RNA sequence: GGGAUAAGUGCUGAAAGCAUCUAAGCAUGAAGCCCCCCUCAAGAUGAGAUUUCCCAUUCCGCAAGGAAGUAAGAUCCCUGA
RNA sequence: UUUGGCACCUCGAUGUCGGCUCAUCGCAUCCUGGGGCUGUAGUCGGUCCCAAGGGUUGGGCUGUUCGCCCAUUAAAGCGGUACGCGAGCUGGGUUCAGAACGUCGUGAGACAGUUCGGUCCCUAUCCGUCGCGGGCGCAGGAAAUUUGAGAGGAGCUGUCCUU
RNA sequence: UAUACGUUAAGUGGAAAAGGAUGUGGAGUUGCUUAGACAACC
């Protein structure tokens, strides 16, 4: 794998523990990230440098060095920067509102929708019609961000519902 | 208890004097009906020069029945005759009178216009 | 879950403040007593031990007025075990009484059916007769015992044999008056059993 | 979804493609979505 | 007792 | 109402610098599946558990066994539903 | 599951159509549940995927299966089980002897042409099915209360109001 | 529960065709490529 091949820079205040199996906890300035890799897949940190080292070179091996450099790539990225994708409301009275920490969504049901994210992810609401999933795992975040978008998807007339931000919607014509 | 080939007398001057009951409505294998239930009906008999003709399939009413009614009370009502009145599909009488006293179960299923036309209401 | 034993005594009715009358049953059930608990550690499941009637001492044995000293009271005769009960709350000798059930409180009524003796497949099964006329000899019989292919007849062919006797729950039955000088539920509607039969009262398992 | 013996490209944007041991295409025109069966 | 028989013309 | 799933929808993600629901990993999701609800159930010979009661008799026998009278308890017989 | 082909079991008899009674199974799903695509605006639909839990009407005509029709229904599924089930029922039809019509035959008679009429036997031995007892077992003898391996049952769905 | 070297991941093995497919093993031909290809990104 050329991905599994490239080696990541990791800055002063990303520490990288390992243990039994190969698993390596990532601290830094927003949290802790652990993961549990495949044991026969070789890591190592040298003068601040993380490099996946592939021991074979069976089709199985190609998939999880690759696998492991990227997810190493956004567990550091993750403690340093953050992700966060971002949710536009789309459509006549659909509106975002926070309530402490639920979503409460308004998006053309007979009740209001809610959603409680979960540790380490946190959502912002800055429009009525705009929601924010920030957090360190590129995972969670872009897992709470579907389960948002899955509450009312943009249907293909008007373009009305919950879409990623800069989504293109397949916008059919009605008559 | 009114099903599949009872004959009603009808209690109103849309024509009719007797009707055979086609089918009870409001469910698949439903046997019999009761005071404030729809039926369809055929007439067998008509009072020549009325609006509702022999022959006609037509839905009605029932207003009164042998079996009667129990109330929520523990009191019960019974009449002599079984009798409907034919009725269009929002509920009003095809007819202008009603003849005979009808049961106090018809305000229940909303039919109105048949319990005000009613001589009484019992 | 809480609970009561006693006896059907019948059916009356009674009207509601609204003027509907409602038919109930009369359980009279005599305060029942707490005569064991069972424990997850000794037994290995938590329930108590209700004991309700009192029962002369010549229709007592040893056995019987040895296991209800701890309770301190007299034989009894009948004796049911709840469980999904509170455990704290009940101790052994303590009375449970008809008053631990208030008015509109839903439950669930166990009893035995009446027993109805032998009876044929169309009073048991409720199945249909054949033709009464028409040239039929089939009227009361219980249909086909099944097809040639598997020269047998299927499990649950259902046939004549005794009918009744039998365990029965009818649930969420409301109770309607509870008459704790004269030891009585009134449960709107009809419970299992012959009169005199033991009744069971619980909690309702679906509230 | 067309579930048919013959997954082919439909058209040019049609990627065919294998999951859970089944062939399948995917492609941007969602008439196009087909998977082997 | 039959008219013509078991598996009958 | 739980739990796990089907089709389906995915998230993250390489093999294959991209893309990709899948290969590692993580979800979601049917009147259906396993429960939940009702009944029978330890001949479940794998014969389960708890509580309580009786109490270690007499005579044959080298003992091994055997016989007898009993305990707690039950039944015959009787009044019945 | 059809019509057949073959003629392998049964001619010292494997009762033969339809219905009734009683079901049970398959899924190629009629309804209800979940979906993808749509020449899916909505309401409706079309088409394909998952799904066999439960459900799946009463009449007129005809021996009828089927079918057509009336009126409903959420729906009025398609098939298997000796065209499921006659030692369970029916006996309209088919399938004996009477009689008749058309027709064919010189005739006696003949016709999956028609017509009116026309004996449906059996006290259950065994397994099987549904109930109910007795015996012994379960390292003493008893009286109660129980756990639940395991098994059975149930499982359908409309309309209205509101949003 | 032999030995050796391979193959298969489908319980294929342990029933089936046209046809469909970046499944995977082995051969071989060939376009293009540090005069920098292929993919990504003016
Ligand atoms: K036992
Ligand atoms: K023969
Ligand atoms: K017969
Ligand atoms: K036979
Ligand atoms: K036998
Ligand atoms: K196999
Ligand atoms: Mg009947
Ligand atoms: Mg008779
Ligand atoms: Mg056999
Ligand atoms: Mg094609
Ligand atoms: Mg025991
Ligand atoms: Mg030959
Ligand atoms: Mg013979
Ligand atoms: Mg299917
Ligand atoms: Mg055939
Ligand atoms: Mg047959
Ligand atoms: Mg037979
Ligand atoms: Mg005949
Ligand atoms: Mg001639
Ligand atoms: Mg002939
Ligand atoms: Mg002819
Ligand atoms: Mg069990
Ligand atoms: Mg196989
Ligand atoms: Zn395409």
Redo the contacts with the bound molecule.
Sequence with gaps: ????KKLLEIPSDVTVTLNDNNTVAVKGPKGELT?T??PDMEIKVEDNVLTVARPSD???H??????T???L??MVEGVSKGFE?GLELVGVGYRASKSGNKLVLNVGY??PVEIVPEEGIEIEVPSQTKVVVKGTD??????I???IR?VR?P????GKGIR?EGEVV?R?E?? | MIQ?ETRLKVADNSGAREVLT?????????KTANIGDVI?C?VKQATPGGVVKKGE?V?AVIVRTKSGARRSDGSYISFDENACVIIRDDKSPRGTRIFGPVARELRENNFMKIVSLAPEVI | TKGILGRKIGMTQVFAENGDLIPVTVIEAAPNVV??K?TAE????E?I?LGFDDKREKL????????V??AETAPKR????L?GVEMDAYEVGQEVKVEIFSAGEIV?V?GVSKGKG?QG?IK????????MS?????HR??????????????????????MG?????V?NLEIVKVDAERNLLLIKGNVPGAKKSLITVKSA??S | ?????????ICEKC?????????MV?CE???H?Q??? | ?9
Excluded: C, W
Aim: hydrophobic content about 25%; glycine content about 12%.
């Design positions: 794998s050329r991905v599994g993961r890799f495949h069976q089709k199985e190609r998939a999880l060095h690759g696998t450099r990227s997810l790539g956004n994708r007979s009740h590129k995972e969670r975040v872009g897992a961000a579907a389960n899955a998807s249907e293909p007339y008007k990623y397949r059919k009605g008559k | 599949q086609i089918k009870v409505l409001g469910g698949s294998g439903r369809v055929t399939v839905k | 005569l064991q069972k000794n037994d290995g499941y329930a031990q007592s044995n040893k056995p019987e007025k040895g296991h000293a701890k009948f004796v049911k075990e469980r669930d166990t032998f497949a048991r099964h409720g199945q249909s007769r054949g033709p028409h040239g039929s000899r089939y019989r219980p249909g086909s015992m099944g097809p040639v292919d598997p020269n047998r007849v299927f499990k649950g062919k259902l046939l004549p044999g005794r006797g039998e365990q029965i729950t649930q398992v679906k | 979804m067309k579930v048919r013996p013959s997954v082919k490209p990627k065919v493609i294998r999951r859970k041991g089944k062939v995917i025109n969602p008439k979505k998977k082997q069966g | 007792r039959l008219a013509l028989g078991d598996r009958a013309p």
